[model samples]
Target: DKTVRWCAVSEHEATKCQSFRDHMKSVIPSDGPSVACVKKASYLDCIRAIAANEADAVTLDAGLVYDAYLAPNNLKPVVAEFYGSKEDPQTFYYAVAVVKKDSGFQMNQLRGKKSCHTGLGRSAGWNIPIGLLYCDLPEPRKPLEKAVANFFSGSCAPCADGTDFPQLCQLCPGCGCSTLNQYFGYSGAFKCLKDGAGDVAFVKESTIFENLANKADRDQYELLCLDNTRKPVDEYKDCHLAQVPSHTVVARSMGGKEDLIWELLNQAQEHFGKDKSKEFQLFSSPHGKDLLFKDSAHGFLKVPPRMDAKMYLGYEYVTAIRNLREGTC
Candidate 1:
């Protein structure tokens, strides 16, 4: 009798997963396959661990999905997260480059400026902006991060804050790349710009609305367009860096247990979905924000059988993700 093994990326998340297993054992074990927990320090490892048969079920970010498909690790994104509402759920969001409205900054004059990013490897934060800026740089391209680091006076992308470049790492408040840093993730990166530490921020379109409630407060910032123009934050659709796919659950494309994974995901929400249960919730991990699933996510949506990772992320986004590796090959 095989059981679905859910990989947790943190100790706290493992404990939460353990409790979820216990609840599933008591409520749906006989009818549904049982669940177990595995632990890894990061989702990057979670992917390889599963490829080695270390875990059975794992979730991946959209950017990571690109690697999962192209790399030797053949993985399939089986489940997708949906936000907004059940009736009007959305599976994609816009990545935007936001700058203060009156900073006298133009879309093309961002060189030698301070910037904030959601984090390293994130779609909206690192990959999108990095690839776009790579195109902005003249011929004889340096390494992607190095070129951007040289272009910007400083950047605050969490994982990029190591010995590689001070110009990119100095603006961050935490111990460089640690999540403990005040300017770590989306909210943190926005805080970096909101507090005036950065001249620009790479964040999702919803970030502005989620942070600033008042229209006037939001107007203090505008999005920098690829066309060398600035648009109101509300004009993200016209000025976004990329349209990123939502985070998703992935399994081995070779022998993945998609049926079992889907069953557990369906049951996970029915019993413990957002505010549906108190003791355990599938989308709420108080010990850490976005431990397994994003806190902002309302529910899960099944990926169509035909929608593989490359197709799921769309042609443009896959182009953006693949664009990161350009000029090398």
Candidate 2:
């Protein structure tokens, strides 16, 4: 029996991974396959490790999953994380643009505005909005980054290099080129807007509640609807930019033990799910929530047997990602 190798990027996640490994050992002492940890410096490094057979599996963001599904690695999504209830499982979430309630800018009037993004190539903050914005370029042949730099007067694209794209880093408060800054993740992007560094912030629907405390604070922001209208922040279901596929657990196509991985995950969740126990919650960490997966995930959903990435991500979402990469790279 081969040992199952799981990848972790940060020190916090590495700690969580070891804890998970120990828990699995205790749960199925004799019969279960052994689990191991493969530490990497970053998410992309984890992807490279899996593709090179140095690791077997890892949970990936929707956008990174798209990259893994493409050339070089050809990884497949084996299991999906579900956010909603058992009565109504949700396989997708919405990505929306937010701005101050009184910013006086519609979705169509984004030209020359200061913007904030969770990160480059991120599903909600980068791919969806930038892909849509790419369509407005007068010179369609121009590189996506240049066009974006020209479109936004200043922006905080966390993963963008300040020297390579200074315009994208001007609005960021921290290191400007990496997640070292406070304005890096979904909440961070909203913080960029909240702190007055940006006129518009691209983020997910759930970000409103995650960052703001009361209804009064939440009410001070509004969402930019795709139809060039502005709506209340809570009205995402009715007015939104795009519905994105959920993040997924990916493994290489060859020698990828789907059955074994799922069996372990299925058993592990029952014993360590969000509501299971305090000793070992598969989805939570006191030190760092969402260490390995999204904190809001309720449980895991098995992907259709033998489904590839394109099928799992759906046609529209896949095309959007392809468009973004092709235009930018």
Candidate 3:
């Protein structure tokens, strides 16, 4: 009754997760459920661990949420993130393709250009772009890794199967073997572009502003609008490639201890939320940012009761993501 295991994606996050758990145990009622931090090497690993009951919960990117929704590992999104004001909350973000302003590459002219992707199955970096490009491939039945390799002159798709498609792994700064690579996630993909290794980068709308907040710094990049045009980074809400659901905290559909889990989170937020003055903040990180959740998050919002991944992500997005998987396969 006192053990509530949580999942962590990286060593840094695991350390932070354990610290948060320790803080919670001390603050919560002694009879309340306690936290246990379980570490996994990757997001997919965390999903499998939770589904198998080896772990109770983990926060996931929307793309991975869709993956968890599929057979053999039916997980549910129990909480969502609410950005902006409390009165008018936002539950989604724009997914866009970005490029340096001087690069002169349009969305339709991406062929033979060097590319950067967050990971193999990421929402903005992999799924959305692949969903748009899969139909244009010469062999639609080929593995997505293969099609992407041929489409780009050279690319950095972190976590790609290098042995099967070496070209896709060519530009990756990470070890061409696994998710351990430094260039596997959002920051890594942007690094590829900043380092001149790629011409275009697939990432979320907030990415540019996060790294290049100043006016001069922000002016260097632009978004590749789906309309075959380009626009300033701030215009993403008006002109984006796709509007994706927010990331979620997921758990096994059965035996997930939903009530206790929600209680723990609610209490934790009450004490350690954004405005909280406690020393151990729920979302602040000095070792590494975005430890258990996105660094930009204000707080967690409890998802509707009994809302599975499909219900939370909506039918259109699910279908688009599924189309990418099937069309690539």
Candidate 4:
């Protein structure tokens, strides 16, 4: 008789949700709680739907979670998805600043130097580095892009529309946000520095090792520490810009049916989790794209009590994004 409504942000997502609902309804337990799928135009709309009692839960990326905490919406993340190994799951990634060996430069000395980034608007590639480097945007008229363009001599921040700030794309070969440019991701940014196009690459801690498996090759690079000291690429734990948290499941803050939500998800993982069910997988899709949950997600974990959306999003990161965005948009 109990039906928990799930918000689907896209037609494709709703289609998948339908299958999950049907599969859940047909389960062996005759009295098990069922599911009801609610369709929404977008994730933002999904948030609104939850607040309005049109839906019960929606999984959202890190970017939108911040927006959810703002007035009117008043939602909190009840559960979060952890990626990677079950033994050593990774719920977060570390943003890092990497440079070639013998550069002898420190974090504060990055000004006027050629830089490399994964892409514009990306967590590791853009937001964290810019937010930390800019510290505090002094001039309201100057946006975050302008500050980055003038701060560095030349850079290849792919996936950025450098129309107004051509200098931002001056170093990129393809000058696009997509694969039109070969350098469009973590590997792309690392290659930019490796190939000598830029002096420093702003990326995550894993990029260096993930690209170069050999220890000797990896030793050619070093990470910039906040205290102006540099450490081997292996020392990322001590040297990182910020820890970027993973995606989360959001629900209404005040009275979001937290007990049922947890009960449903706990039962879900027990019955339909990774390799637990052949009929439906909670963390995968037939189209190979992340549908209801992240394709990379390993499982879910309960968030601490009173851990509202704003609290889940660290204060430093919140302020950093705030510093980058002007009052306009």
Candidate 5:
């Protein structure tokens, strides 16, 4: 009864989505079914549309992929992934914490400085970068618990864990730690930094850099340091930063159509072919293309033998999905 609906992060991605849909429609049989296309100008907006039942499917950055995976109550994910890195030097730098050059705050000086993030649901916006924060500086268990408790008492999990919860910070259904607060959000965060809000603003490295670079404001901030690592897909002879692995695409229909989705995914390498240059261009952020679908990209992740789903994948949000569905959560 429902159409095969689809959504994309930007108009450019939407164009590609339409092209893929058209190509699929042309090749798929008449009885295959019809697809309805929609364009979401922003990545977060696309997920919000899908959760609200305005759309059925969408694609987003691997960093932002957590939001889509969290929509179990009203939505489901289909074939989500972060591309493997390619030969482009452009992909080297990432969006990260930048301190005002005048701030004189070294990395270790950030002992209790507040942070600005896009939101909890976003991957690079929050998860990828924030996870690094937590990894480097583990949040005080008590403070984090208090943060979760004082913020979300009734339901600890929020949207993914609560009822009709975790809307955008502006539309939060209930009290919870809002990424939109000084602790997070773009405008609130920027204002916070200038007003002595928090020590760091977790900005999209590219957008922030491009904006500040134009103003020749290099003196305003310094890019923080985190130990970089090589990706599973390949190693860059150049310096490689932390990697968020290519996520396994889990469809909401995984319960019933697991076989079909699996078949599709298994055949993805061959079906989608190696000429994913356009897909890379379309899906990439200003940070450059993801490290998932590069030349050595494969149809399936080279998951460790006998390892559970969550073990190797970067974040716990996705691990939760695998655990809940496949007992790996």
Candidate 6:
């Protein structure tokens, strides 16, 4: 019998795990025995489990994989992502604050309102939003300077510069979403909107619509358009929550099992990516269908080049995980 442990975020856990097993059994079938799959609640947990041998491998977010690699103790990436976000280097779509329904304000007017997000400096939560805000700040606001000062000085909790000139409330504690702060909110984006605690809250695509569902108050707010930077602090530009590659599948380290797992993920990804493959025929692309994967009758396999996680969305994660201090906890 064979049991392959797997983990993923709530929205993707089941689909990713089952895909892994199906691809292996369909192609890599040996007298290979029985297969069992276990579910983990979050991407970070998935990385931790795989490290401890509680799980054989994890199908996790690309961002989380970057953060894990930095930990040096918890994760070993085995596979590169195969789908989603197609920008060169692959960027993703995350949400940023717009305006509330009744607010009837534009992104420019939001300067004086409350801006709620996971926390400053978080990849998906604080960093992305701040990046967006700074880029969007009009002629006179000096968004970048204020944001940096706020982070280092720690004087403004709810308001930047003491007068609600971008009030960012830090609410909700003990919520593990902070672990994947890139996903959404601590108390949920809805709670933030309902209570009028923030003019806008940064959230992920999955949660963005769901959180806004069934709320009349939501009519008051709209998502803002902002630009992503070409380089860090590269004079804020307008961008949106784009779909980048999802979590990367990693091996524990440089080992056979890890190699096997990488091969397996690509095979499975190819199965779902057949259609998309044909669409990119117009250009020479380095993703999804362009990368050929073959199921050697027992399992499908694809070997990827060594990666520099910092070259992609994983950089934000790398920084945060490195900053964690257990002694203080």
Model 2 lDDT tens row, 2-65 = 4778888767778888998898788776877667898886677888888898998898768878
lDDT of each: 0.78, 0.81, 0.79, 0.77, 0.40, 0.42
Q: For residues 1-329, could you state the per-residue lDDT of candidate 5 as single tens digits?
A: 12455554444445555655565555445655444677764445655666666665543344445445453532343443433343332322244554555565544555445554444544444554434434234333233323322331122121232233332222223323332123333333344444554455554444343344344554455555544221211122222224344433333433323334344333434435455544422232332222122222333433233333333334555653333223310
lDDT, residue 145, candidate 3: 75
Number of the candidate with higher TM-score, 3 or 4: 3
- TM-scores of the models, in the order given: 0.84, 0.89, 0.92, 0.63, 0.46, 0.51
Estimate, for each residue in 198-312, the C-alpha lDDT of model 4 and write its tens digit: 9998877767765787999998999988899999998999988888888788888777877677777778877788788888888776733457676667888899997976678
- Could you tell which candidate, 2 or 5, scores higher by lDDT? 2
User: Which model, 1 or 5, shows the larger TM-score?
Assistant: 1
Task: Give the candidates in order of TM-score, highest first.
Answer: 3, 2, 1, 4, 6, 5
Could you tell me how far off, in angstroms, the CA of residue 46 lies in candidate 3 after the best superposition? 1.5
**Residue 24 error, candidate 3, Å:** 2.1
Query: Where is model 5 more than 4 Å wrong at Cα?
Result: 1-3, 7-55, 60-95, 128-198, 209-215, 226-241, 246-250, 255-329
Per-residue lDDT tens digits for candidate 3, residues 107-134, read: 8888889888888877888888878877
* Top candidate (lDDT): 2
Q: What does candidate 4 score in Cα RMSD to the true structure?
A: 6.0
As for lDDT, the candidate ahead, 5 or 6, is 6
lDDT per residue (tens digit) for residues 157-253 in model 6: 2212233333232332223332233213323443554566555555444333434454554444455554311211111124344333334456565
Each candidate's number of clashing pairs is: 1, 0, 0, 1, 13, 33
Q: Which RMSD values do the candidates have, in order?
A: 3.3, 2.7, 2.3, 6.0, 9.6, 10.9
Rank candidates, lDDT, best first: 2, 3, 1, 4, 6, 5
